[PDB]
């Protein structure tokens, strides 16, 4: 009994893994075929802990999948890589990496090398990215019915359509109220300062991004105010109660007026500390810790309201929407930490809690959308919609670039590099055509999911786009017809675009440079 | 061919271990006949010539009881509907104290009725407004069957007369001298003003002689023994305290500094001293005994014997505060020498070996306080046991009949009385109801035949025998025990009579526990943990 | 080694506030000359934070 | 129950004894005390004009009660429905017969 | 960390078997306040009257502080009367063993670190007669004078890796002696 | 498919419930009913730890089994409760009972009804009770010298029928000494008794001081004289040791010689202490909590007696013998605080040593020094002289009397037979099983003394029938014989209770027909 290697590990080699490599990836291409384009069908996950998931967006889709095979596992990193990037398009990437990496399949197994696989790769990924540069359409950023039309466009395939032309104004809104400059430094911070608050039971059109935020807070005292016309918010970071203190103390009694004398002394404290919160004469005061009653009793002699123990991310939000600053130790406050510019406080009943909001502000730079429905997955849905719109809108502020959609720029991108291949010489062009006709899957797709023969249509389609000036033709999937996407409508960032052909690319060379797997070992 | 899936619907979503009923068979019929076999079950220990019966509780130990609230209560029942008629019996022994097993007999043959009614035809919703209708007209009827009100409740012998056929059920073979007994304790502690409360009524069990030994004292008796040296005290001046019977100490953690050595020689001495000054200042009042409710120290014990002061403990807060509500006295969580005011007066405080159970007693002599005590002998600790409850559902009978009296005659008067004249009412009615009227008859009918069949005689021919009397115009007649024969006699002179208030109760509960039970068309239970 | 002992009340409060005052001073220091950025190797509580972010400068922990 | 006071009593809630004035207590005109087996209630009825109210419920035993709470839970929602929109329908299925109507006319 | 609790308010259930009131002892108990529901509201309430009770019954029991200064002539009445049910953990030890001077300053710290337990320190030699130097470094614990364990080693006790393992070596007794290496393993 | 009672509970309605419960009731009894009478057997049981007890007396016995069946309990309870209100007539209450069930199942096993049949045994038990106070023979003359005979005789046939039945005329006279001489309280912790391994049965003592083993002693001991002729004994419940002042306090000096101070003070509190103690003019020195070994050593010196650790019993029975009083300060140790006694001594006997308090005139409180050749030799004298004591302790109050030997239960059951002719119906077939139940007793006693139960049990009820009452069984003889004359009596109190309880556990029984037994969760 004398091992080399230990127990565990196992050794496969050879042609049979690059294949079951090229499988694994199809598999999953074979998952999400059917959730691509406006008449995508509803995806149901049964989450492990107990939940449900009703999705189509393919990384909403992949990531309550758990898969043994590697390959697959570099497919999830592809999903979750598309999700972070740019928002949009996963999907897309992961039926372009399977397909491709299936189309290499054909010369794998033709005793070609995959090294110059992987240069006609990189050599049509470079060309795609330069052809789909080539035919963009610039847009213009101020006008406010190209933005709705191209979130209308990218939002059209997905659950909340049918409320588009309400959704999509709210995701411009947002993404036109979080749009921040500092220092010479613009954020559009969607992720920290754009919340999305889902309240079950309601109507979807009740839904509303709000000038300020709104939080599920309630009073500390009920004699507090619950509506305020003006307020002056002032932030709290520390807490409004006596604490013990970092270094031990072990004070020591022995006269009869030290014990009481003690505790009027943490009274008074605490009095000095709402006295001087109160010297700037704010309106409301929230803070992050905790207030003992004697303070809220000072608060309340004063006619200030004060909010109770909020989450960091909250108060962050407060404090951009109202202009003020968070502070730590009230005797360091100052005129200009007041928050002056909230235009409203309620503290409203929905169901049976108590949401604050803080609503109506003069220029917030932090928003919150009441997000009302009928259900937890119904909302968490329209969630997911709503921030796939935000970061196509914050892809076209931050790139004024725009591609045709529905199947034109791909069909448009594999004629050009077709036409590009038909003059070089040599033993490379077989791979750059394959990623050629790669490409073609979109449309392919697209057909087969709005029920068309894909075969007359997807001819009809390559014919009429080889003549000249019409890149922009594509296939119409709400009837399946061949039509042209100006006379349509439908337009996606150029940044979605281009980053899927390149993430795609990318992954396809990953799996395909890969001949070895050694399994089990600690 | 060989296997019958499930349906495809609520059958094949349900878990594992749950079972769905659902139907007028497999969900009404199934809780008719358990509550049938429940009521059955004690229908044996039903009056005075009920057997008792011993049960073993999931911790082994025994209780020998015809009690049926305690009956129930002791066996865990496992079937739903048989829950719903067990909280309907112990809410009816808890708003009356008596008319458990009237409970239970009469809602299991309301049920069978029920069950009769539904195979003949008749809908559920038939049934159950026919017995509320019912039921209203019995409570309609109920007050113009009162007889000989009681206009006393403070001479001896009409109360013991009044709770002896309360207690009978239960102690048949020794019925006035516990009646007696019982009697002058609820008298002595009847209050001239206010409100009468059965908490105030003690009970203690002591190991001994029979029955006949058992008496009442007009104050308390405890189990405790007297921690000093002085055993007998003569008109005591009892001092109560809710604190340790030791100098007081600070809450907050505080340590004795001493910096220099005469500090030192002199801390135990100041002690001391000071120990022995309130002890004096406590004893110079006249305390003769001092009741604490924490630890006594060792220094006040032996200044408490230097200066002739009975030292006892008291080990919770409720003996504490009966105590203090006996003796008149107040605790004070300071040792502040009582003042004028607030400083109980008590006859005699005994130590007394009884049963080889050395106690300690607070009794008075002029038949006061607003605390008697019953010391109860026996032979049997479940004997004793057994005269407790029968003390206790005694004392609740009282207690009902300060409130509105109204005595009815019982022995199965009142049932067959109501029976007949429920029978005339529902002859009257043309609608499809009448049935269910006509059914409170015969759920009146099982409360006298259980009574003819616990005491071995024939149950028609006395049902019919009540009918001919009562249709005669007597209403004031019912089962006789003692006739080993069928046979009837007059219940107003036998003096054997029961609460209005609790057949009220007793009524309305067992008419609403078949009404929400017969209400229930599915069940569907989940898998036990 | 070092642990504070009260034996008059009075004398309590003073020292809380020294309990933060000495690392605000550092702060100030630190602030004092026209420094703008600041790394540390170490964790930075709330105050200090907030006494960057009043100043104008950002805190690295 | 300090707001449900402050609103009935007509007082005002206090977390310090700083100043303490007749202005800071509320009446009532009647509070007394019903012992209910081993437990303990106080009543404080007979009020001028209260503006917070209480559904006292008695049972029998515990699932009539729970019962009567979920009946008077949605009593209480359905009137406060009927006065925060001034509008109702009509019942007994007859909207959705009429709506049905309409549809397939439509 | 304290990190996690300002991140985003999206912190769902992660290695959490158990969430809920009953466990949250003061310090936590406190901090969500406005999250513990109203309904069960008075069970929390009845919770912390009763933990809080118990707390006040252990602080009449969990006032030690430090070490103390006991010799050989005071043994047998801190080891036979010392009280009922209370842990006391004899060291014997002499000054300039260094393993021994470490295992020392660990237990002053543990004095304050655990007032429950007083453990008592003598001289080796003037504690028990005749005590050979091999054993200079020595513990043992027990209640009521009954002798749990005794190890005894100068080099077998790894002084160097004591702390927190052998802490709770020292600390965790009637019962399975194995029971907190694997917690700080030396590896 | 849905069961009403939890699956595990088992019922026994109906009347062959009942017989088993009697069947059950015999089979205890059987257990007892060979350790009854002067020629009496001992019973040894085992435990599963492997302590065997060595008993004749009822009460033990059935303490000492494993008890399930509820009727059993019942039996297990009456014995207990009789044990604990007379002090014997356990076996006898046992005996009745099973006697009184056995002699009324053959007259349920066709059914009948229970209540008629506890009707008959309440209305014999009353009447039986009745008889015997009525007929019990009272002295009626407060005298001495024939009381203290009628406590003799009544302790002398207490104690036959015991393991110490030889000796009888030495333990009874010693026994009722001891209650002739406590306070008119009967406290039973002043009887306190001590048992010492090894030497004869007769060698057993009674100290009318107060005697009890040494505690402890520290470096110091036998140094102290062990034999004083006139003490003044000084009763202790501070501890003389040199210990913290407080367990509580806390010492915080500067300086050496504070230092020095301190623990110069600490010393001066001790001899403080000590010298209080010795200027009281004690001799002898007993304390509760422990005396260290310098207070030995300083008590030694002053050529005095110390003996700390003594428990609450035996201080208790030292200050209401020696007359002192207990202290917990020495401030104040007055000289009439202290207690006085004739003689002390520090003896060694049966390879123990022995402190002996010998003299006190004004002493209300015994010692019994009992000597035996194994544990559970000297535990059963023990329970012996436990037994005698409650009847003497019970007999005190009241000089009224039977005649053992049956002879009680035969004029009970010739009254009942009389009774029982006079009345119709099924009462009288009742009351004669009753009458006939209750003449077990004379019929197993002769059976344990091996005789022909049939043939004297028809001579003592011929003689009872007309002749003169008192004429029980004489077992030495073999005969019948007048047990008044011969000089055995038993308390009428413990026949009644006796009776009593055997009646009301019978009623219990037979007042039964339902059983249920829940799955022990
Ligand atoms: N009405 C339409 N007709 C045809 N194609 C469309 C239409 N709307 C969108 N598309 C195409 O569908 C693609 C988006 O589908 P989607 O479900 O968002 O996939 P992914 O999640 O991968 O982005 C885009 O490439 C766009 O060109
Ligand atoms: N001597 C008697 N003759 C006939 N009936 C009697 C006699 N004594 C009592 N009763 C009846 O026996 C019944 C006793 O019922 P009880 O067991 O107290 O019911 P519960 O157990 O529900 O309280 C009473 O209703 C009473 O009418
Ligand atoms: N010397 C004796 N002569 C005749 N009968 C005796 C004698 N000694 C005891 N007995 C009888 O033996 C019976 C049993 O007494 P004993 O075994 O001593 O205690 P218990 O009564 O508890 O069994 C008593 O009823 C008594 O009358
Ligand atoms: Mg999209
Ligand atoms: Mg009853
Ligand atoms: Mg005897």
């Given at each position: ?99 491709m990496?299936?189309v290499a399949?054909h010369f794998?197994?033709?005793?070609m090398?995959?090294?110059v696989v992987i240069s006609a790769y990189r050599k049509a990924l470079d060309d795609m990215?330069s052809t ?281 991108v594999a004629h050009a590099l077709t036409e590009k291949s038909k003059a070089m010489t040599g033993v490379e062009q077989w791979p750059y055509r394959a990623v050629a006709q790669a490409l ?65 690319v990318?992954?396809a060379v ?13 | ?529 | ?61 | ?106 | ?187 | ?521």
């Open positions: 009994p004398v091992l080399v290697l230990s127990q565990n590990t196992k050794r496969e080699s050879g042609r049979k893994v690059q294949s079951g490599n090229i499988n694994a990836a199809k598999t999953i291409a074979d998952i999400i075929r059917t959730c691509l384009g406006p008449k995508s069908m509803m995806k149901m996950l049964l989450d492990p802990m107990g939940g449900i998931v009703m999705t189509n967006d393919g990384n909403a889709i992949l990531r309550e999948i758990q898969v043994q095979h590697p390959a697959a596992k570099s497919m999830i990193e592809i999903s979750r890589t598309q999700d972070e990037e740019v928002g949009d398009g996963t999907t897309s990437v992961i039926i372009l990496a399977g397909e990496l299936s399949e794998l197994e033709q005793q090398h995959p090294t990215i789909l540069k080539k035919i963009s359409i610039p847009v213009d950023i101020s006008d406010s019915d190209m933005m709705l039309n191209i979130i209308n466009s990218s939002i059209t395939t997905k659950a909340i359509s049918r409320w588009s032309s309400l959704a999509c104004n709210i995701a411009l809104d947002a993404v036109k109220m979080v749009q921040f400059e500092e220092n010479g430094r613009k954020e559009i911070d969607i992720k920290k300062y754009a919340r999305v608050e889902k309240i079950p039971g309601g109507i979807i059109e009740d839904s509303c991004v709000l000038r300020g935020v709104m939080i599920n807070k309630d009073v500390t005292h009920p004699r507090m105010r619950r509506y305020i016309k003006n307020p002056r918010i002032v932030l709290l970071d520390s807490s409004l109660e006596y604490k013990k203190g970092e270094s031990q103390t072990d004070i020591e009694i022995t006269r009869e007026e030290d014990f009481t004398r003690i505790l009027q002394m943490e009274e008074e404290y605490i009095q000095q500390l709402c006295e001087d919160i109160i010297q700037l004469k704010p309106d409301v005061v929230i803070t992050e810790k905790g207030i003992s009653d004697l303070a809220q009793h000072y608060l309340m002699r004063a006619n200030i309201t004060a909010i109770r123990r909020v989450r960091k991310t909250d108060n962050n939000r407060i404090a951009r929407a109202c202009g003020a600053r968070i502070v730590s130790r009230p005797e360091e406050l100052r005129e200009d930490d007041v928050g002056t510019g909230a235009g409203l406080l309620e503290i409203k009943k929905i169901g049976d809690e108590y949401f604050t909001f803080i609503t109506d502000c003069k220029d917030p730079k932090a928003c919150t959308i009441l997000l009302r429905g009928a259900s937890k997955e119904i909302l968490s849905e329209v969630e997911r919609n709503l921030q796939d719109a935000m970061q196509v809108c914050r892809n076209v502020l931050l790139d004024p670039q725009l591609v045709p959609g529905g199947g034109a720029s791909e069909m448009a073609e899957v979109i449309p392919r797709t697209l057909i087969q999911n709005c029920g068309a023969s894909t075969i007359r249509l997807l001819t009809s389609l390559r014919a009429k786009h080889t003549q000249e000036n019409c890149e922009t033709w594509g296939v119409n999937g709400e009837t399946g017809t061949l039509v042209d996407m100006k006379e349509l409508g439908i337009w996606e960032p150029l940044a979605v675009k281009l980053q899927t052909y390149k993430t795609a990318e992954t990953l799996l395909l440079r890969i001949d070895d797997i050694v399994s089990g070992h600690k | 061919a060989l296997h019958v899936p499930k349906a495809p619907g609520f059958a094949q979503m349900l878990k594992e271990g749950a079972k769905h009923f659902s139907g007028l068979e497999e969900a009404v019929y199934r809780n008719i006949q358990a509550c049938k076999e429940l009521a059955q079950t004690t229908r044996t220990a039903y009056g005075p010539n009920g057997m008792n019966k011993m049960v073993i509780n999931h911790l082994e130990k025994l209780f020998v009881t015809n009690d049926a609230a305690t009956i129930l209560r002791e066996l865990e029942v496992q079937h739903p509907a048989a829950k719903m008629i067990v909280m309907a019996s112990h809410m009816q022994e808890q708003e009356v104290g008596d008319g458990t097993n009237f409970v239970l007999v009469f809602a299991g043959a309301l049920l069978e009725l029920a069950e009769e009614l539904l195979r003949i035809g008749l809908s559920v919703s038939e049934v159950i407004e026919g017995y509320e209708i019912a039921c209203r007209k019995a409570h309609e009827i109920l007050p113009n069957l009162v007889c000989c009100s009681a206009k006393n409740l403070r001479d001896i012998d009409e109360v013991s007369s009044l709770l002896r056929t309360s207690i009978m059920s239960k102690q048949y073979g020794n019925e006035v001298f516990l009646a007696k007994l019982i009697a002058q304790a609820c008298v002595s502690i009847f209050p001239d003003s206010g409100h009468f409360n059965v908490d105030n009524i003690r009970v203690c069990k002591i190991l001994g002689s029979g029955i006949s030994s058992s008496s009442v004292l007009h104050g308390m008796v405890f189990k405790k023994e007297t921690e000093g040296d002085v055993t007998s005290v003569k008109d005591a001046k009892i001092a109560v305290y809710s604190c340790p019977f030791d100098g007081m100490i600070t809450e907050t953690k505080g340590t004795v500094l001493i910096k220099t050595a005469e500090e030192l020689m002199n801390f135990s001495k100041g002690e001391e001293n000071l120990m022995d000054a309130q002890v004096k200042a406590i004893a110079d009042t006249g305390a003769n005994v001092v009741v604490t409710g924490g630890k006594v120290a060792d220094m006040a014990l032996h200044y408490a014997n230097k200066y002739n002061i009975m030292l006892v403990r008291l080990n919770s807060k409720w003996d504490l505060r009966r105590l203090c509500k006996t003796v008149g006295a107040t605790a004070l969580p300071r040792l502040t020498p009582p003042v004028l005011e607030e400083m109980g007066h008590c006859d005699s405080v005994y130590l007394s070996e009884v049963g080889d159970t050395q106690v300690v007693v607070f009794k008075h002599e002029k038949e006061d306080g607003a605390i008697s005590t019953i010391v109860l002998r026996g032979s049997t600790d479940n004997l004793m046991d057994d005269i407790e409850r029968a003390v206790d559902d005694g004392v609740n009978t009282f207690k009902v009949l300060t409130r509105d009296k109204r005595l009815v005659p019982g022995g199965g008067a009142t049932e067959i009385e109501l029976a007949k004249q429920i029978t005339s009412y529902g002859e009257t009615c043309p609608g499809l109801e009448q049935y269910a009227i006509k059914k409170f008859a015969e759920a009146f009918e099982a409360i006298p035949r259980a009574l003819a069949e616990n005491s071995g005689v024939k149950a028609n021919e006395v049902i019919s025998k009540l009918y001919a009397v009562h249709q005669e115009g007597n209403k004031n007649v019912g089962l006789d025990i003692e006739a080993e024969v069928p046979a009837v006699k007059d219940m107003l002179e036998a003096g054997i009579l029961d609460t209005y208030l609790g057949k009220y109760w007793a009524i309305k509960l067992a008419t609403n526990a078949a009404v929400t039970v017969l209400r229930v068309d599915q069940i569907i239970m989940a898998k036990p943990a | 080694g070092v642990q504070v002992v009260i034996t008059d009340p009075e004398k309590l409060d003073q020292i809380r506030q020294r309990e933060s005052d000495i690392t605000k001073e550092r702060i100030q220091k630190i602030l004092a000359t026209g420094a703008n950025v600041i790394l540390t190797t170490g964790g930075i509580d709330d105050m200090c934070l907030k006494y960057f972010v009043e100043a104008g400068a950002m805190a690295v922990r | 129950n300090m707001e449900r006071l402050t609103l009935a009593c007509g007082g005002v809630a206090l977390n310090s004894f700083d100043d303490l004035s007749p202005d800071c207590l509320g009446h009532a005109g009647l509070v007394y005390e019903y012992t209910l087996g081993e437990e303990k209630f106080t009543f404080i009825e007979k009020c001028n004009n209260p503006r917070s109210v209480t559904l006292l419920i008695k049972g029998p035993n515990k699932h009539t009660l729970t019962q009567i709470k979920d009946a008077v839970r949605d009593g209480l929602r359905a009137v406060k429905n009927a006065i925060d929109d001034g509008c109702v329908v009509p019942g007994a299925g007859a909207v959705e017969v009429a709506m049905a109507e309409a549809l397939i006319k439509h | 960390e304290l990190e996690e609790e300002a991140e985003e308010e999206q912190r769902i259930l992660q290695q959490s078997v158990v969430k809920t009131y009953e466990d949250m002892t003061l310090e936590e108990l406190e901090d969500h306040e406005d999250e513990f529901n109203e309904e069960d509201e008075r069970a929390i309430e009845m919770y912390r009257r009763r933990r809080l009770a118990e707390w006040k019954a252990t602080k009449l029991k969990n006032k030690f502080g430090e070490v103390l200064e006991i010799s050989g002539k005071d043994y047998v009445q801190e080891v036979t009367k010392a009280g009922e049910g209370l842990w006391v953990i004899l060291h014997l030890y002499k000054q300039g063993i260094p393993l021994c001077a470490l295992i020392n300053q660990h237990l002053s710290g543990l004095a304050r670190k655990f007032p429950d337990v007083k453990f008592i320190k003598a001289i080796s030699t003037t504690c028990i007669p005749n005590y050979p130097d091999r054993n200079l470094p020595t513990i043992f614990v027990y209640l009521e004078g009954d002798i749990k364990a005794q190890f005894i080693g100068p080099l077998v006790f790894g002084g160097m890796n004591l702390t927190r393992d052998e802490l709770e070596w020292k600390l965790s007794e009637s019962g399975a002696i194995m029971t907190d290496l694997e917690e700080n393993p030396k590896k | 498919p849905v069961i009403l009672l939890k699956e595990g509970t088992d019922s026994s309605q109906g009347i062959p419930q009942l017989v088993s419960n009697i069947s059950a009731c015999q089979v205890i009894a059987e257990a007892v009913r060979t350790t009854l009478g002067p020629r009496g057997m001992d019973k040894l049981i085992v435990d599963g730890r492997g302590k065997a007890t060595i008993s004749n007396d009822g009460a033990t016995i059935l303490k000492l089994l494993d008890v399930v069946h509820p009727a059993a309990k019942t039996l297990v309870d009456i014995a207990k409760s009789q044990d604990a209100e007379v002090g014997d007539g356990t076996t006898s209450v046992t005996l009745l009972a099973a006697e009184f069930l056995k002699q009324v199942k053959p007259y349920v096993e066709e059914g009948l009804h229970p209540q008629i049949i506890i009707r008959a045994f309440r209305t014999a038990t009353q009447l039986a009770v009745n008889k015997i106070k009525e007929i019990a023979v009272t002295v009626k003359k407060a005298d001495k010298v024939e009381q203290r005979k009628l406590l003799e005789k009544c302790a002398m046939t207490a104690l036959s029928s015991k393991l110490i039945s030889q000796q009888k005329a030495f333990f009874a006279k010693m026994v009722v000494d001891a209650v002739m001489m406590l306070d008119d309280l009967l406290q039973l912790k002043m009887i306190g008794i001590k048992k010492v391994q090894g030497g004869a049965l007769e060698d057993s003592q009674l100290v009318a001081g107060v005697a009890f083993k040494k505690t402890f002693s520290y470096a110091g001991f036998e140094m102290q004289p062990k034999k004083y002729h006139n003490p003044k004994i000084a009763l202790l419940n501070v501890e003389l040791e040199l210990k913290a002042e407080k367990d509580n306090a806390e010492i915080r000096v500067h300086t050496v010689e504070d230092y020095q101070a301190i623990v110069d003070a600490e010393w001066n509190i001790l001899y403080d202490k000590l010298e209080k103690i010795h200027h009281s003019g004690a001799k002898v020195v007993l304390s509760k909590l422990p005396i260290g070994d310098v207070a030995t050593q300083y008590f030694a010196d002053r050529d005095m007696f110390c003996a700390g650790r003594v428990p609450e019993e035996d201080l208790k029975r030292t200050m209401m013998a020696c007359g002192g009083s207990i202290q917990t300060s020495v401030n104040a140790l007055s000289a009439d605080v202290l207690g006085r006694c004739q003689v002390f001594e520090e003896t060694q006997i049966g390879g123990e040593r022995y402190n002996f308090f010998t003299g006190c005139p004004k002493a209300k409180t015994c010692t019994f020094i009992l000597r035996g050749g194994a544990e559970q030799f000297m535990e059963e004298t023990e329970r012996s002289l436990h037994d005698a004591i409650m009847i003497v302790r019970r007999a005190i109050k009241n000089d009224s009397v039977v005649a053992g030997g049956g002879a009680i239960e035969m004029e009970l059951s010739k009254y009942l037979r009389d009774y029982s002719r006079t009345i119709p119906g099924k009462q009288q077939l009742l009351i004669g099983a009753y009458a006939k139940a209750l003449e077990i007793i004379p019929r197993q006693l002769c059976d344990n003394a091996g005789f022909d139960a049939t043939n004297i049990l028809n001579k003592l009820r011929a003689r009872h029938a007309q002749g003169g009452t008192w004429y029980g069984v004489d077992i030495n003889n073999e005969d019948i014989a007048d047990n008044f004359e011969a000089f055995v009596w038993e308390p009428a109190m413990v026949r009644i209770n006796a009776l009593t309880a055997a009646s009301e556990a019978a009623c219990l029984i037979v007042s039964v027909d339902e059983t249920i037994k829940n799955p022990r969760s």
